[PDB]
Design a protein around this ligand. Structure first.
Ligand SMILES: Cc1cc2nc3c(=O)[nH]c(=O)nc-3n(C[C@H](O)[C@H](O)[C@H](O)CO)c2cc1C
Ligand SMILES: Cc1cc2nc3c(=O)[nH]c(=O)nc-3n(C[C@H](O)[C@H](O)[C@H](O)CO)c2cc1C
Ligand SMILES: Cc1cc2nc3c(=O)[nH]c(=O)nc-3n(C[C@H](O)[C@H](O)[C@H](O)CO)c2cc1C
Ligand SMILES: Cc1cc2nc3c(=O)[nH]c(=O)nc-3n(C[C@H](O)[C@H](O)[C@H](O)CO)c2cc1C
Ligand SMILES: Cc1cc2nc3c(=O)[nH]c(=O)nc-3n(C[C@H](O)[C@H](O)[C@H](O)CO)c2cc1C
Ligand SMILES: Cc1cc2nc3c(=O)[nH]c(=O)nc-3n(C[C@H](O)[C@H](O)[C@H](O)CO)c2cc1C
Ligand SMILES: Cc1cc2nc3c(=O)[nH]c(=O)nc-3n(C[C@H](O)[C@H](O)[C@H](O)CO)c2cc1C
Ligand SMILES: Cc1cc2nc3c(=O)[nH]c(=O)nc-3n(C[C@H](O)[C@H](O)[C@H](O)CO)c2cc1C
Ligand SMILES: Cc1cc2nc3c(=O)[nH]c(=O)nc-3n(C[C@H](O)[C@H](O)[C@H](O)CO)c2cc1C
Ligand SMILES: Cc1cc2nc3c(=O)[nH]c(=O)nc-3n(C[C@H](O)[C@H](O)[C@H](O)CO)c2cc1C
Ligand SMILES: Cc1cc2nc3c(=O)[nH]c(=O)nc-3n(C[C@H](O)[C@H](O)[C@H](O)CO)c2cc1C
Ligand SMILES: Cc1cc2nc3c(=O)[nH]c(=O)nc-3n(C[C@H](O)[C@H](O)[C@H](O)CO)c2cc1C
Ligand SMILES: [Cl-]
Ligand SMILES: [Cl-]
Ligand SMILES: [Cl-]
Ligand SMILES: [Cl-]
Ligand SMILES: [Mg+2]
Ligand SMILES: [Mg+2]
Ligand SMILES: [Mg+2]
Ligand SMILES: [Mg+2]
Ligand SMILES: [Mg+2]
Ligand SMILES: [Mg+2]
Ligand SMILES: [Mg+2]
Ligand SMILES: [Mg+2]
Ligand SMILES: [Mg+2]
Ligand SMILES: [Mg+2]
Ligand SMILES: [Mg+2]
Ligand SMILES: [Mg+2]
Ligand SMILES: [Mg+2]
Ligand SMILES: [Mg+2]
Ligand SMILES: [Mg+2]
Ligand SMILES: [Mg+2]
Ligand SMILES: [Mg+2]
Ligand SMILES: [Mg+2]
Ligand SMILES: [Mg+2]
Ligand SMILES: [Mg+2]
Ligand SMILES: [Mg+2]
Ligand SMILES: [Mg+2]
Ligand SMILES: [Mg+2]
Ligand SMILES: [Mg+2]
Ligand code: NA
Ligand code: NA
Ligand code: NA
Ligand code: NA
Lengths: 64, 64, 64, 64, 64, 64, 64, 64, 64, 64, 64, 64
């Protein structure tokens, strides 16, 4: 059985790095992270010093 | 990093109040709730005394 | 077996009340109305005296 | 010919009132506003004093 | 309030049995599982001995 | 001209049999049922003795 | 209150004429047909003498 | 950079001609119109003398 | 078993004729073309002498 | 690099077996079939002796 | 009230840089640009010297 | 007439480079590749040495 958690990563560099940011967080607290599916991307502009890229992923991990 | 939990709030009054019901629950058990996105709305009719409005939200909260 | 009918309710007050308007109509002519799913919302503005909120629902009822 | 503008209204009270907020703004600056279609709803929580309901609408107006 | 968890069940027999596999897992660790919604189905072919059917479900459970 | 009715079939056995349940019902009351399109699947769990599979279909029938 | 019926019109000439075919049928049996929304288009090729264009519409009519 | 405007054209003749109606309007007031994407089609029936076909397009134009 | 190929037809006349253009091409090189499903429509404007209507279809053909 | 082909399998027994029918066909003519994603399901009723279940899959295979 | 404009940025380097290209343009002519949502990505290949990445964004800005 | 093939490119570096990987493959075996549309992105994590970014594209090429 796989379970997914819906995480939004951020990065001041790129959409790819914002995906990695979410995946890094999942791997910090979850065992057996197997894949991620991009479900949304955006950019925070007027509440941040630099533009922040965001990539939202469903991060899948195998249960047990 | 933001994480979302997928909650359905209920209310006998309105769709807005059913959204608040889910958000209240998230704020009970989660720190740093930042926003909610409506993903579905419905009404329970024939298993309840009064019509119950339901609003399903992805409730986003900042990790750490 | 459940069947759905696709109804748009209207109200000069709110989206919730426009949903109720469609559900009321379904309950007038159908037995065993069990639930409704919101599929669209809109507002009629320039052909009405007051803004009219509209909520379109799939209203489910149990057959037999 | 109709044209649509994509507006997000806000309200501290309800999703219906947040729709009205966007429609009010369209009627301030546009002639012949005829209808609005709800395309999204959400709630701002952790950057506001009170929860703020948001309703995003495509507001249609007749050209000429 | 209902909460959903996004689980992918697997089975070497059928899509229905892969749904049951996810639901079984939810019932192992969650109280008050009330319903599941199918959101995706697939088949793993070239990394398994036998084809494995997969059914991804949002499994809803009542909070409290 | 074809018309569709939106029916949810149920079964304690499988998604396929729940589709048949809706189609059987359509064929009971309609002439010239030609095809069905699956639009949703789910499982009722916590209000039934046994899990009940549900398959929602648009059942198409030729008018005249 | 508006209700919609989901009809597929056919024509050997065009998608527009296939829409009219469904609308004609609705106007034959329904009072107060107000609008139609195109939801799908297709072409039947290998079971017909000539290609047949099909346009599927939700045909809306005002109740009462 | 391209920008899109969301226009609904109308015609008493066809969906193609309703698309042209929106595109004509865009070309009246915009320079460098490059393409259009159909996003919706419908028919106005019960508020017009003759059925009116409508085609909604995102009309893209190159900025500068 | 049916297979689909994803083709975009073009025409200087209409969306229907652009669908036929793709279907003609499929029938040139494929046996047993049975149906087509419209998946997108658009208009090329600023790189062509005359506006070109485009209709994208999944063209289904029976294998064997 | 993976490539997908869009196949509809059929079966007089079940949706799972109709998926297998498409996958079998892909494995007949393609090397390195790795997975399939269900994209649609339906039932042919009024042109067949027995109801025929259909499952449409994107069948993925590794190139080279 | 927020308003969105639908812009496609281009870049010969990356999808992230194509998003920035659209956002830069919005910030050139609009005050209070607050966020952008990615709605599509593509690559222009056979009408350009080098591949051009494109990222289409809804760019949101606060009115007033 | 344009035809599309549905390819998933991979890269250990970025989503943009994974798109290029699919496009490179299409240009290896196809003449007149004109554009690509991103339809999905993901990351393979727990079956690879390094995270692998994947970008799925519909790659369009002109027939003849
Ligand atoms: C993808 C994305 C979507 C956003 N959507 C909203 C929104 O709908 N409403 C909103 O108030 N702020 C939104 N924001 C945040 C906005 O940019 C700003 O930080 C907040 O408005 C401050 O309260 C969004 C930010 C991002 C990156
Ligand atoms: C939005 C919504 C969707 C529902 N969908 C279903 C359904 O698909 N099948 C079902 O058995 N009950 C459904 N119900 C519950 C139904 O109204 C009733 O309470 C149950 O059927 C009792 O078992 C739904 C209720 C709501 C509010
Ligand atoms: C949600 C919604 C969508 C509508 N869409 C259309 C449309 O696409 N075309 C149209 O002519 N009128 C549309 N109208 C009606 C419009 O506001 C006006 O009453 C009619 O144009 C009068 O013929 C719509 C109204 C609502 C509430
Ligand atoms: C519907 C909605 C969606 C939002 N989405 C985002 C988002 O994707 N990323 C983000 O940083 N903030 C988002 N926000 C804003 C967030 O709540 C907060 O105000 C900002 O993060 C401050 O920078 C959103 C707000 C709303 C109301
Ligand atoms: C529904 C489904 C979707 C999949 N999608 C992907 C994918 O996008 N990329 C991938 O590398 N593997 C995918 N796989 C796994 C693939 O079949 C194989 O096991 C892995 O490629 C091994 O690394 C998928 C498997 C299933 C069942
Ligand atoms: C596919 C599916 C969806 C459902 N969705 C809802 C829902 O949104 N809200 C709800 O109260 N019950 C829902 N139910 C019914 C739920 O399981 C239970 O029977 C009712 O909550 C009893 O009132 C659903 C059941 C099914 C099978
Ligand atoms: C838009 C459209 C979709 C169709 N889809 C299917 C299908 O999924 N399966 C099928 O057997 N026939 C389908 N057909 C019918 C097919 O062309 C042929 O008439 C039947 O296969 C005969 O049994 C479709 C026809 C049209 C116009
Ligand atoms: C595509 C389309 C959608 C429409 N949707 C609506 C609607 O949701 N509600 C409505 O009142 N009128 C709608 N209308 C307008 C309706 O036909 C009639 O002109 C108005 O109801 C008059 O107020 C629509 C018209 C078209 C062409
Ligand atoms: C439906 C449609 C969509 C198009 N989308 C794009 C696009 O996203 N980017 C682009 O550069 N050109 C696009 N074009 C082509 C554009 O009109 C023009 O021919 C090219 O920009 C020349 O390089 C599109 C054309 C059509 C018909
Ligand atoms: C999923 C599915 C969808 C279909 N859609 C259509 C359709 O849109 N139009 C049609 O003529 N036949 C359709 N058919 C075929 C229909 O049942 C019948 O075999 C044909 O109408 C014979 O020409 C479909 C069949 C299936 C299984
Ligand atoms: C995302 C994207 C989508 C496009 N879609 C189309 C299309 O549907 N039809 C078309 O003629 N050109 C399209 N083009 C443009 C195509 O690559 C080429 O520049 C034009 O065909 C020249 O007229 C598209 C380009 C991009 C980047
Ligand atoms: C976007 C993406 C989606 C995937 N989906 C699935 C899936 O649904 N089921 C699965 O078994 N593996 C999936 N995988 C593959 C998974 O990560 C792992 O390699 C396989 O499970 C090994 O059999 C996917 C991989 C990617 C990159
Ligand atoms: Cl989710
Ligand atoms: Cl828009
Ligand atoms: Cl329907
Ligand atoms: Cl495809
Ligand atoms: Mg930096
Ligand atoms: Mg988002
Ligand atoms: Mg009360
Ligand atoms: Mg729901
Ligand atoms: Mg009042
Ligand atoms: Mg509507
Ligand atoms: Mg107040
Ligand atoms: Mg939003
Ligand atoms: Mg076995
Ligand atoms: Mg999946
Ligand atoms: Mg049994
Ligand atoms: Mg459902
Ligand atoms: Mg003729
Ligand atoms: Mg169809
Ligand atoms: Mg005329
Ligand atoms: Mg519309
Ligand atoms: Mg001509
Ligand atoms: Mg297109
Ligand atoms: Mg048998
Ligand atoms: Mg289908
Ligand atoms: Mg360079
Ligand atoms: Mg695009
Ligand atoms: Mg490297
Ligand atoms: Mg994918
Ligand atoms: Na989730
Ligand atoms: Na219906
Ligand atoms: Na817009
Ligand atoms: Na394809």
């Amino acid at each position: 059985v796989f379970k997914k958690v819906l995480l939004t990563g951020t990065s001041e560099e790129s959409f790819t790095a914002a995906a990695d940011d979410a995946i890094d967080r999942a791997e910090d607290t979850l065992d057996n992270v197997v894949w991620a599916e991009v479900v949304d991307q955006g950019v925070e502009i007027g509440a941040v010093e630099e533009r922040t890229y965001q990539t939202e992923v469903q991060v899948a991990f195998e249960l047990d």
